[PDB]
């Protein structure tokens, strides 16, 4: 390996290279200027970004001596053996020659010294502290460390003279992902149909080793494809194809979000009949910030992110969420209404923090708050409470959606059939700014939804859905679904009884118009008039708030 | 035990076979294509699916060196010795041959390293993290892991290089269940009248570790029958009877009617005895419910040919004492889908957010062992209209009903779970749960008519001696407004 | 004592109870008076700490089981007897329940508590037994 | 160094500390500088061991046993002053503490001048919380 193998990081690689080379390649300049540079460096960031890879690259390209210390290798059973081990390591590093000390997984040896309760670990960390600085502490040997939880280190060990510089090997951007892809495809033979730039543009949250995993999967698919047919004829002319890469991309997800992978659901914009204007509005809301960044910063304004669906139940809010989940390049995080609450104290806010941190880590990401009124309701209304845990939760949501954040691409979709129960602090612009009313379908919308549900069903040639759409007046999407289901059920009954009659000693290849006619007798309006009046009043009150325009 | 004894998961079996065998059988392919294969697998799924069995098969079949690591086997008293044990295991694996490392029950030595507070677990986790992926990480050794809950694992371990891919060994299906039954009934002495396809059909939520239980129970019944017929034979069993044991269909049917899926062992309902002939009247409702619950399960092929998903929900409302709970008992008795019964205010708890946890747990138990019929008696308690109460008990009722809302129809995987509701005050149920897709059809159960009353009287008097000359038509005429309870 | 034996260490309070029972059975037929069992018997359903359930199970195993007790009796004490395991109020563990809650008893206690001191000649104990009508003893 | 007072042989740490302190006292009116007292001051509650008891008690006994003619004083440097064993803080062993606080703007300028007096040069008002 070498510096050419590491990719996706330029500034961090430059900092490490200078701090490791200039001290041991141009030392006369350091005494000429007078002041020595920082002597310790701490690599931190999410897992699988290139920390140990960077350490290996430094050990390879640099001709100086190298000594590696894994996390818990230092400490053993015998009393004082851990400190003896550190002393031996440092002495052998300093005695022979200029050397680089790399301690892997430092967080396993340096607790905070205030929350720990053991004895040996405290003595070990104090040994490390006194060994790094003091009289005859360190002479012409540089120290390297890698960690995944930088906050889990005692601050006393993270001052100048011990670890002066902290380098953040963070998530790569599109260019970094492209560089990593080019690096990992340098050895395998690849077909001409590939388009690496678009592929990198599609891996919207991948980091480091995840790209390598994608490459490995795309390779494995070909071996399992060009093996059913069976010699040197197959050993050559492999030619990893673009379809293999697309397939491997379709399955794998970023390692950060592996905990919260949503179960596969299959729908499409053709499946969501009606709501064409709302569909296009959502497309231009969700895709423009991600697909056209440069022109976005050309105007110098941030994107608009939040959105709330509100309307009568069984109209398609969750269906729209499913469509966005399955047919958008951005990552998806499905969150239920009360799924985040917990019995313990403060764990609900911890779970909310973890969810939003996972979301913004692998940006762009979409978070779908299902039945938002469950966990984001009016503040102070509850007289008898559990210590105001719900109030704290809604306050946590308020701070997390808009506050002391980095303004990364994280879109929140809220779905609730009860909008008056949401606190006004969430409905403000900046958290959930545009409130989309999802009304009951009209006649053309009824025809569209009926066709969308029946896009897969075989029907008679003379059958027309216009009469069904015209007959229903106050119906919603779920009611038309029920009509279709009843018709299919009656068709199944006819099929099975005909099959039994034939077996007594495809009779129904289609669903007849008679089945729809006699399945519509039990049809009903799910949404009563009271809720329709209430939602219309809510919309009219929203419009009435605006005035003089 | 070989590879021909693990049936039900062919895809996962081949998927593991790929990296465990092919890079050792034919190493030319990977050097030809230029990339190394994955060397990390995490087997997860509900208990009793074949994870340890598959590990045994891999160990027995492959010629590579095998090293077994039990989960809590590593711990020692001295500080820094568990990691010493890990070092000895991995160094032996690397020093000897191209080996396979199987870590059984890895969730007990791999927590998140952030919620735990003990020092030894953090240090051992860091040791494992460095051993799998660090400097000069691994030389042609593949690591296998098994767990019952994957979410309680360190995220740093669920990465390429450490655990490349996670295989999901889940609940089998009809073909898988038939394969398991064939495998487990290949060494025993069956009768000539036994058929397995019907037996594999009638078994619904069995995870594959319950099929072996079914076979063992059938064998135990056979021996019990042949030891009841023959004398106990204290000294020595006669050899002639051993020549003919067999196992009839009745033994399997009896064992099937006793056993239940291991996932539903906590929620087993007491065996009540109601039959379709015990419920008089309501013939149209009885047939409608029978078809609505039977058509999606036995004949999925037609439903998929019509490209529409079956109807799930159903609600019963009417005056008290008309047969709603009786219909629920009748469904629970002689229908083939699994049954989960809950009373009205049974899933409520003192703690905050625990009621929703219970709802999640019961609906997960229902979805795992599908098809399943969930009976919610007295819906008015758990699904009362939300927002009506000016006062509140902390808003818990709103949260529980919302959980029900988005657990019966939300961002979840569609599966065969039917919800039967029973109430005597439908007006105080939120409309959001009465729409199609959650509770499709709302059935009314009126007070019985003359013919219905006569049929009800006959249904109650199946096993009652009466006078030959007693006529019940006058009784039916005399009431004119009664219910079944009267 | 109740609070004394309970600890935060894992597998220590159970060891303490086992050592206590071994000591009691070792020397001679003895009487074990375990005070305030309600603090270490939370009914196993309303509790959340695992140490409480573990010590409850240890107590149950010590009182009843294979060669549980050999000529040694145990006495308990509590203010609220309801907050105890039903398994502990069984026969073989706490088969007998005694209610230790009047004027004559109060007078007897007054007489026995003033036996070792010559108070006076004109002190009448009837007024004391009638005026101190709410004294436990 | 605090964490360097233990040893491999059984109880050989006590001999090491004893010979160290007696050599420091017997030679001359020297000055002894003790690092990381927090490493040897866990409040007596979070120890649960025996080596700490012996070594700390030995240090207490030896610190108490200091004749006036020794003319030797110890200087301690603790970064966690509230996590100190009060037994060590009693009068006659360690009575006077010094609150080494945050420097002022003038102090920041002074340290800046001190550090920059060994480099080729071609701030104390924006630098506020910086210390040392």
């Amino acid at each position: 390996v070498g510096y050419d193998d590491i990719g996706g990081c330029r500034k961090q690689m430059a900092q490490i290279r200078e701090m490791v080379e200039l001290p041991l390649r141009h030392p006369q300049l350091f005494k000429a200027i007078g002041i020595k540079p920082p002597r310790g460096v701490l690599m931190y960031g999410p897992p699988g970004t290139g920390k140990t890879l960077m350490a290996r690259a430094v050990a390879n390209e640099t001709g100086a001596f190298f000594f590696l210390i894994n996390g818990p290798e230092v400490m053993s059973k015998m009393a004082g053996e851990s400190e003896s081990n550190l002393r031996k390591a440092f002495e052998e590093a300093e005695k022979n020659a200029p050397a680089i000390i790399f301690i892997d997984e430092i967080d396993s040896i340096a607790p905070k010294r205030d929350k720990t309760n053991g004895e040996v670990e405290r003595r070990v960390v104090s040994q490390l502290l006194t060994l790094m600085d003091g009289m005859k502490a360190r002479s012409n040997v540089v120290v390297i460390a890698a960690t995944n939880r930088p906050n889990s280190i005692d601050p006393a060990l993270r001052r100048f003279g011990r670890f002066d510089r902290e380098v953040d090997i963070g998530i790569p951007d599109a260019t970094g992902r492209l560089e990593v892809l080019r690096i990992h495809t340098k050895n395998m033979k690849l077909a001409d149909d590939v388009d690496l730039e678009a592929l990198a543009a599609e891996t919207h949250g991948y980091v480091g080793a995840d790209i390598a995993s994608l490459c490995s999967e795309a390779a494995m698919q070909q071996i399992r494809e060009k093996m059913d047919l069976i010699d040197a004829e197959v050993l050559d002319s492999l030619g990893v194809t673009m379809d293999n890469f697309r397939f491997a991309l379709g399955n794998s997800n970023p390692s950060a979000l592996r905990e919260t992978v949503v179960e596969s659901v299959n729908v499409t914009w053709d499946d969501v009949g009606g709501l064409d204007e709302i569909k296009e509005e959502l497309k231009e809301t969700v895709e423009y910030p991600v697909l056209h960044p440069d022109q976005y910063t050309k105007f110098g304004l941030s994107p608009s992110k939040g959105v709330l669906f509100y309307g009568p139940p069984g109209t398609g809010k969750t269906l729209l969420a499913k469509a966005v989940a399955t047919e958008v390049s951005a990552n998806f995080i499905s969150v239920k209404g009360p799924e985040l609450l917990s019995m313990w104290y403060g764990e609900s806010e911890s779970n909310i923090r973890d969810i939003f941190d996972k979301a913004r880590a692998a940006a762009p990401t979409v978070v779908f708050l299902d039945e938002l009124d469950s966990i984001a309701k009016a503040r102070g209304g509850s007289l008898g409470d559990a210590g105001g845990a719900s109030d704290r939760v809604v306050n946590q949501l308020l701070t997390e959606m808009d506050g002391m954040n980095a303004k990364k691409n994280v879109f929140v979709i809220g779905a609730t059939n009860r909008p008056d129960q949401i606190d006004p602090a969430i409905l403000r612009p900046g958290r959930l700014d545009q409130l989309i009313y999802v009304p009951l379908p009209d006649e053309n919308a009824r025809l569209s939804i009926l066709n969308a549900q029946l896009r897969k069903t075989p029907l008679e040639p003379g059958l027309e859905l216009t009469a069904i759409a015209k007959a229903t007046q106050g119906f919603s999407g779920a009611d038309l679904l029920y009509i279709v289901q009843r018709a299919a059920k009656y068709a199944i009954k006819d099929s099975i009884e005909a099959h039994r009659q034939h077996e007594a000693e495809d009779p129904v290849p289609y669903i007849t118009k008679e089945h729809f006619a006699e399945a519509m007798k039990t049809a009903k309006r799910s949404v009563s008039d009271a809720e329709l009046r209430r939602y219309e009043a809510y919309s009219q009150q929203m419009k009435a708030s605006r005035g003089q325009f | 035990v070989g590879y021909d004894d693990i049936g039900g998961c062919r895809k996962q079996m081949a998927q593991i076979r790929e990296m465990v065998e092919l890079p050792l059988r034919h190493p030319q392919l990977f050097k030809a294509i230029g990339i190394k294969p994955p060397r990390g697998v995490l087997m997860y799924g509900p208990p009793g699916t074949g994870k340890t069995l598959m590990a045994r098969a891999v160990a027995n079949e492959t010629g590579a060196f095998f090293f077994l690591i039990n989960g809590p086997e590593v711990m020692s008293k001295m500080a820094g010795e568990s990691e010493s044990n890990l070092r000895k295991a991995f160094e032996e694996a690397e020093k000897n041959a191209p080996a396979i490392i199987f870590i059984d029950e890895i969730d007990s030595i791999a927590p998140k390293r952030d919620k735990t507070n003990g020092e030894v677990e953090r240090r051992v986790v860091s040791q494992l993290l460095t051993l799998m992926d660090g400097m000069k990480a691994r030389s042609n050794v593949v690591v296998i892991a098994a767990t019952n809950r994957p979410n309680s694992i360190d995220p740093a371990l669920r990465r390429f290089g450490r655990f490349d891919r996670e295989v999901d060994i889940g609940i089998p299906d009809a073909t898988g269940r038939l394969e398991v039954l064939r495998i487990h009934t290949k060494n025993m002495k069956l009768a000539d009248d036994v058929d397995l396809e019907a037996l594999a059909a009638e078994t619904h939520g069995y995870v594959g570790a319950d099929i072996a239980s079914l076979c063992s129970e059938a064998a135990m019944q056979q021996i019990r029958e042949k030891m009841d017929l023959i004398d106990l034979d204290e000294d020595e069993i006669d050899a002639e009877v051993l020549d003919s044991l067999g196992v009839t269909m009745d033994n399997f049917r009896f064992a099937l009617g006793n056993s239940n899926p291991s996932a539903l062992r906590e929620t087993v309902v007491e065996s009540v005895n109601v039959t379709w002939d015990d419920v008089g009247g309501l013939d149209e409702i009885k047939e409608e419910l029978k078809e609505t619950v039977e058509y999606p399960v036995l004949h999925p092929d037609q439903y998929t040919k019509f490209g529409l998903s079956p109807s799930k929900g159903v609600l019963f409302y009417g005056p008290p004492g008309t047969g709603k709970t009786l219909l629920a008992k009748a469904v629970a008795t002689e229908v083939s889908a699994n049954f989960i019964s809950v009373k009205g205010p049974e899933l409520l708890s003192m703690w905050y957010g625990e009621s929703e946890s219970n709802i999640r747990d019961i609906f997960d138990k229902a979805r795992a062992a599908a098809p399943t019929v969930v009976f919610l008696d007295e819906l008015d308690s758990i699904a009362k209209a939300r927002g009506g109460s000016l006062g509140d008990a902390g808003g818990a009722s709103d949260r529980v009903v919302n959980q029900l809302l988005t657990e019966m129809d939300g961002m979840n995987a569609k599966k065969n779970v039917f919800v039967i509701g029973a109430t005597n005050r439908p007006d105080q149920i939120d409309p959001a749960i009465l729409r199609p897709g959650r509770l499709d059809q709302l059935i009314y159960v009126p007070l019985p008519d003359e013919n219905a009353r006569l049929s009800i009287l006959n249904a109650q008097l199946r096993k009652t001696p009466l006078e030959p000359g007693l006529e019940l038509t006058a009784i039916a005429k005399a009431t004119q407004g009664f219910s079944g309870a009267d | 004592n109740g609070p004394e034996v309970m600890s935060k260490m894992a597998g220590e309070s159970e060891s303490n109870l086992r050592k206590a029972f071994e000591e009691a059975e070792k020397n001679a037929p003895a009487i074990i008076f375990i005070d305030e069992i309600d603090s270490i018997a939370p009914k196993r359903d309303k509790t959340n700490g695992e140490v409480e359930r573990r010590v409850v199970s240890q107590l149950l195993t010590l009182m009843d089981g294979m060669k549980a007790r050999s000529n040694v009796v145990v006495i308990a004490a509590t203010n609220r007897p309801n907050s105890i395991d039903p398994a502990l109020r069984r026969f073989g563990r706490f088969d007998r329940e005694v209610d230790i809650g009047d004027a004559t008893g109060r007078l007897e206690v007054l007489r026995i508590h003033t036996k070792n001191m010559k108070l006076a000649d004109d002190v009448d104990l009837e007024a004391l037994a009638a005026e101190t009508h709410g004294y436990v003893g | 160094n605090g964490p360097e007072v233990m040893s491999k042989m059984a109880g050989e740490s006590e001999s090491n500390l004893r010979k160290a302190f007696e050599e420091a006292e017997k030679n001359a009116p020297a000055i002894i500088f003790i690092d990381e007292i927090d490493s040897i001051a866990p409040k007596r509650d979070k120890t649960n061991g025996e080596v700490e008891r012996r070594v700390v008690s030995q240090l207490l006994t030896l610190m108490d046993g200091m004749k006036a003619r020794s003319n030797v004083v110890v200087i301690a440097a603790t970064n966690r002053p509230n996590s100190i064993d009060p037994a060590l803080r009693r009068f006659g062993r360690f009575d006077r503490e010094v609150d080494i606080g945050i420097p002022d703007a003038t102090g920041r300028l002074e340290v800046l001048r001190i550090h920059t007096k060994n480099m080729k040069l071609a701030l104390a008002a924006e630098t506020h919380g910086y210390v040392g």
Partner: peptide
């Protein structure tokens, strides 16, 4: 020679309960 030993017993958590108000 002497030897060390590790020990990690337990900790203490806090729960939250819900109450019902009768106005």
């Amino acid at each position: 020679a002497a030897a060390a030993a590790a020990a990690a017993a337990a900790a203490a958590a806090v729960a939250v309960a819900v109450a019902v108000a009768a106005a």
